[PDB]
Amino acid sequence: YDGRTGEPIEGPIVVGQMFIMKLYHMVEDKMHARSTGPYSLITQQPLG
């Protein structure tokens, strides 16, 4: 049954138990932003 309308999905749906894992790739560790910051010595370009 659809939870928003209470009507059934028009065809039968495959449902069951699955084993799912959470991976070490988390968006908390990856989001990064910069306006200005440190610059390199020789090239005077932003660091990485």
Added chain:
Amino acid sequence: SDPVRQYLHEIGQVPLLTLEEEVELARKVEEGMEAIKKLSEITGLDPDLIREVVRAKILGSARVLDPKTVEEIDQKLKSLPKEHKRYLHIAREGEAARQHLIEANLRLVVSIAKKYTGRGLSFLDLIQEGNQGLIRAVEKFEYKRRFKFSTYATWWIRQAINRAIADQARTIRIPVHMVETINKLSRTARQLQQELGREPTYEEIAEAMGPGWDAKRVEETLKIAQEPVSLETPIGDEKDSFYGDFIPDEHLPSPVDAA
């Protein structure tokens, strides 16, 4: 390529000496120096200038003070009546003997210098500094004492090699005495570790060094002995990251500070 084998070939292209030739050459050099000083007294000029012009005339046109003045003084030396052109002759012969003695003894330099590899100077630099020491020893040798030339020359060759190592092995120059202090500290720590079964502490090294030495002084001496690292040291398995890519610039003002 391989300049070491090339130099070794040029070195071996000169025959060694026997005792007769070596003592003859050393005597010739000594008489040449005496003749040079006698000629300087006769003509009133400086011994150094006369030695330089005589060496220039001996080495010839191949080795590039100027031709005008050297020819002037060489003609002034030809103006001597007699018993003084003889001194000129012995001077020239002594300079030729000096050249021959150095060339013949160049092999001892290589034999000595082969034991100082892996201390911050390449093999050919060690050989050249040993050659400089050999030239010094030829300058200072005395054949009257009936000592073989190698006996006296080895000391000067070793002195030249060690002074060169202490002078040119580090990117940041450290004075000679404090280089000896560092080497003594390393030897003392190594023997302390060998006896103790583990790395010594600064207090134990200070005690082993002797009076006037404590843990703070040992720490400072070990601090200054650190060598700089390369800004081009690779980081990671791939050849895409270097060390200097992680070092920011602190001198130039940031845009925020300028505003």
